[PDB]
Amino acid sequence: GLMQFTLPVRLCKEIELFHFDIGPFENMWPGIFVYMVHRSCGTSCFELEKLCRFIMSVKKNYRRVPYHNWKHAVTVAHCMYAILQNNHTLFTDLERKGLLIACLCHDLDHRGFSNSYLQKFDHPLAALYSTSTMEQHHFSQTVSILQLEGHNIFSTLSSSEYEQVLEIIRKAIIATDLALYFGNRKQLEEMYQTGSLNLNNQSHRDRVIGLMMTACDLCSVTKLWPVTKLTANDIYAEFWAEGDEMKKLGIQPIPMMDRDKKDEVPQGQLGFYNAVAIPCYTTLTQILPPTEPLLKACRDNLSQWEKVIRGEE
Numbered sequence: 001g002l003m004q005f006t007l008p009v010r011l012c013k014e015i016e017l018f019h020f021d022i023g024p025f026e027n028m029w030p031g032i033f034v035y036m037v038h039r040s041c042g043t044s045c046f047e048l049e050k051l052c053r054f055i056m057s058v059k060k061n062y063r064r065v066p067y068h069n070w071k072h073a074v075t076v077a078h079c080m081y082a083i084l085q086n087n088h089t090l091f092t093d094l095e096r097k098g099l100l101i102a103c104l105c106h107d108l109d110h111r112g113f114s115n116s117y118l119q120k121f122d123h124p125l126a127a128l129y130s131t132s133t134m135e136q137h138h139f140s141q142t143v144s145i146l147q148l149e150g151h152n153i154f155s156t157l158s159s160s161e162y163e164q165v166l167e168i169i170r171k172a173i174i175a176t177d178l179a180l181y182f183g184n185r186k187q188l189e190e191m192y193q194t195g196s197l198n199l200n201n202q203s204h205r206d207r208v209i210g211l212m213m214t215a216c217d218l219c220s221v222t223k224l225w226p227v228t229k230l231t232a233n234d235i236y237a238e239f240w241a242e243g244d245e246m247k248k249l250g251i252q253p254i255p256m257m258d259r260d261k262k263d264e265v266p267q268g269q270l271g272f273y274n275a276v277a278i279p280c281y282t283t284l285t286q287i288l289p290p291t292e293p294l295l296k297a298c299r300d301n302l303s304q305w306e307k308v309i310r311g312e313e
């Protein structure tokens, strides 16, 4: 009860910033997550013993893939932590509990392959879940781990509070399906601009949490340039492996996933910043002004990719 997690001074200060990098010491990531839960939620939100057992079972159920791994889980949870800490009064007690857990769990048991690849491969998960294939799997893995003995971090919640938090987690994880992001953001844009956005409307909160989930999930593009640049290598290592597997099925992959088209990566990153990233952090900044640093960092990185094209690096 009186046992606080504390970080070294540089981490204690920089963990509060949006652009924080959790570092290469894997053994410190559990403690970093617990630190964030304790400051974001409270030392009373979760039984430390159950939380620690939950975190380590979640770690175990992330795979050794180049990008969609345990480091991505904690990175996305830290971005959520930064959003929640900069928007103290906007979120309920259940939302703060659910969302850090949702982020830690959002890519559970990811194989490094897109929903498209599972569908073209005819993977069993594609017959079980026709849309948002991997995201419904991630939620399924989350419920499975929550039901392991001594793993129920929500056991002190009432029957209906428990159902509400698992519903927050489900919607939050489904929302990380980038196919659903485009329509979610357009609706939020219209709602904010016609002035109809209402944070007491549950369907409206859902949409806003969805966009936060997209923002945290994409947060590699909101880091300092050396982090963003080196993370891109991991992202494309997965894409190119999927491109290879598409070629094994007798299907020319999209250029994004073709390792023969590495030269077109800088222009491909521009498209992504302009079509996905900037629009995402812009609408997020309109709804939640204190998330402006994410939009600023994203714009800085767009400018760095422009410099790559111009041969200035």
Ligand SMILES: O=C(Nc1ccn2nc(-c3ccccc3)nc2c1)c1cc(Cl)nc(NC2CC2)c1
Pocket: 178, 217, 218, 219, 220, 221, 235, 255, 256, 257, 261, 264, 265, 267, 268, 269, 271, 272
């Ligand atoms: O970089 C990312 N996305 C993109 C999107 C479109 N294109 N198009 C190209 C391209 C087009 C022509 C020639 C060469 C390359 N490259 C990309 C990269 C990215 C970043 C983060 Cl942070 N997350 C995710 N997440 C999803 C994986 C689930 C994805």
Ligand SMILES: [Mg+2]
Pocket: 106, 107, 134, 176, 177
């Ligand atoms: Mg995912």
Ligand SMILES: [Zn+2]
Pocket: 072, 076, 106, 107, 176, 217
């Ligand atoms: Zn993710």
